[PDB]
Design a protein around this ligand. Structure first.
Ligand SMILES: Nc1nc2c(ncn2[C@@H]2O[C@H](CO)[C@@H](O)[C@H]2O)c(=O)[nH]1
Ligand SMILES: Nc1nc2c(ncn2[C@@H]2O[C@H](CO)[C@@H](O)[C@H]2O)c(=O)[nH]1
Ligand SMILES: Nc1nc2c(ncn2[C@@H]2O[C@H](CO)[C@@H](O)[C@H]2O)c(=O)[nH]1
Lengths: 288, 288, 288
């Protein structure tokens, strides 16, 4: 919404279209540390957000602020390396701008990834949580990427998220994790977005558990929202990089610097995983 | 607050006063689908929000963006057909602007209506929930219509909502529902405002149940707030248009398009109901 | 963040430094009614926020909108009489501006006080709650004072609050309350910030209890956040001025006007208490 007019997206879509010979079918928003997933492409054509018209230029990070097209295990992709977040200051209509451009690029499916804390005790750091549902905390308070006048050309005023994360892909992945033979079945849980760049206190960590969330992160949710609004089929994972201290015995920490996990073959694992799933995303062509 | 100066309201109040021979006593903010309640007026004098100075012009809707004075079952009214919401983009000081003008129009009571999802399982779609209390989610995070410097001319800095919805009118309605002989007693529950124009996921639906809310909507609460701040006696209903999917068995939906209910004689029912209650609102005159 | 550039703080710090011969070590943000704590100073040098460059001038209050340096029981202090709040309209980067200046003034410890409602039933109005943890409600939704590009010169992008309130000072106070011989041990609980200037409904009062909070206030939390971000050791109290009506039997009220408590020797008590603790804050010098 606000700031971008429907034609802003059109222009950015057309430009891109007339700049990559590529027509993506799957948009992949690499979450922290899983940006390397880009390396798996072929016919990769890189675009710095900055070069792409209207696209939110990366803030301080920038490093890895590029939009990579090309192919992933037999899918015309378009990866977004380094997503945008609320805490960096981007109004949510900028955070999610890419999703709307993607859809206009033909993209009909969006796989969103992220690194998030483990709320569910059973989660072992290193895990990979297939997102089955989200609790949009900043949205309860108004921070919904859909706020503002709705453009019927993208979607309905009150779209429903009840079914955000595609159920099939959920199966097609619970199974793929298995068909691959990965030991600990890919987990599943409710991802709770939480903004602010700081990390949860033990007290916040427990309202999150209480509210029902299994993993705590600071993004994805706005992207899932404007994607669903457009119709994009959506499924995503969540690399549990750490265990949120639910205990006052405390004296430990899940800090980002300790991303490590998101540097481990953990990242690589979720990478190949995501690259396998490509085969399981419905090819618009079908061929029957 | 912000954007409107105390005299902005004064001007809009005076203009209105010097444009309708009507002096309202009850302001009625018709919620989605109960706007038809307008049809029950007499001496109805319509004002398009747009014509009224300083008044927030309706966004995309507009259709039914009018302020209707006149009378309801022996009360000098002023209905607002089509309220303003956070999701349309209106800063809450615009959403609630009307309530402050109303008070300056002499209005001493505000009946607020809305269409909201059913969180309490016992609620059957179609019901009518007398609002006994609200959980202001977007306010916990700052989105309170009272934020900004307080104008003692409207009220106190830290007004209390503990007692938002007038207890009498609650009786005077639990009973009127009965005195009328309506079968299923008018329900009662906590209305939880939730912004964002999208609908609740099954995961959000459950934190709402957990937090204690019985119905989930995207408005009213800011209006109740600035009304109480002014002193307006306040009572309101909530047409449970659908049942929020608290279950993962899911495969159903409460979407707005399926408003239906809010088109049914349900709307009409809550209408006549609201028109009866007019007799039960304390006439400033009294006559002892 | 936003609005203030790193050098804005530098300038305000230098100005102050070159205007008070004082070099504070402890910043004390007096909460409502405990501003009198100022009276306990020596070599007190007052600065009206207004006179200090870049400093957020007080809104309507103003009265008691001053920054008082000087000494408290053997500590070079700098008290802030009358803090800034979200409900007054200050963007959180203004609310917390002082904390960042303080740190640049050399301040290495911040004792934050506030007046807050009692959620935990056991709390008797009048009590004093040593803050052991906070639940940042407006932050869950984005209202974190750290939002925006992070300045590594103040701190890390994702600082951790798991350990906001210094554990030592917590002991050093649970004990000091005792070493002093005060009867009812100083309480302890989770402080939940909640913005909006209005007060909790019985329904909101219960989600707060449910979420785990013991006291409910409308500030502190942003200050604790940017303090921790800078490294400031932090501990704070909370004068339970009233009992939040968790009961529908209701017919009572905790309203600010009924601050009283915060006027009582209660305020004075928490004052001398805070002045004793000065001796227990680690002198940067140490002397071994
Ligand atoms: N809210 C939250 N986010 C986390 C946590 N651990 C990792 N993250 C995510 O990983 C990055 C920081 O490590 C951010 O972009 C967060 O989304 C955690 O414990 N809590
Ligand atoms: N948050 C929420 N609002 C609803 C629901 N059902 C109806 N509404 C309300 O009705 C309109 C959309 O149907 C909006 O103005 C909402 O206030 C529901 O399940 N959840
Ligand atoms: N949210 C909340 N704040 C309170 C309450 N009682 C006192 N306060 C605080 O005291 C002032 C008003 O009395 C505000 O600055 C609040 O932080 C209460 O019951 N709820």
């Amino acid at each position: 919404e606000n700031g971008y007019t429907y034609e802003d997206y059109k222009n950015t879509a057309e430009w891109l279209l007339s700049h990559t010979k590529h027509r993506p079918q799957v948009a992949i928003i690499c979450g922290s540390g899983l940006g390397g997933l880009t390396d798996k492409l072929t016919q990769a054509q890189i675009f710095d957000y900055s070069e792409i018209p209207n696209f939110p230029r990366s803030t301080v990070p920038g490093h890895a602020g590029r939009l990579v097209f090309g192919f992933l295990n037999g899918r015309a992709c378009v990866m977004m390396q380094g997503r945008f977040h609320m805490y960096e200051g981007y109004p949510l209509w900028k955070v999610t701008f890419p999703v709307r451009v993607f859809h206009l690029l033909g993209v009909d499916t969006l796989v969103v990834t992220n690194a998030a804390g483990g709320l569910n005790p059973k989660f072992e750091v290193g895990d990979i949580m297939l997102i089955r549902d989200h609790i949009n905390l900043p949205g309860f308070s108004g921070q919904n990427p859909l706020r503002g006048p709705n453009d019927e050309r993208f979607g309905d005023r009150f779209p429903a998220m009840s079914d955000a994360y595609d159920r099939t892909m959920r199966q097609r992945a619970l199974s793929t994790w298995k068909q691959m033979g990965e030991q600990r079945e890919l987990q599943e849980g409710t991802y709770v977005m939480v903004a602010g760049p700081s990390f949860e206190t033990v007290a916040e960590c427990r309202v999150l558990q209480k509210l029902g969330a299994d993993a705590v992160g600071m993004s994805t949710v706005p992207e899932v929202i404007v994607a669903r609004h457009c119709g994009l089929r959506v499924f995503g994972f969540s690399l549990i990089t750490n265990k949120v201290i639910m205990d006052y015995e405390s004296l430990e920490k899940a800090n980002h610097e300790e991303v490590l996990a998101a540097g481990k073959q953990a990242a690589q694992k979720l990478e190949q995983f995501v690259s396998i799933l490509m085969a399981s995303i419905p090819l618009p062509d079908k061929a029957s």
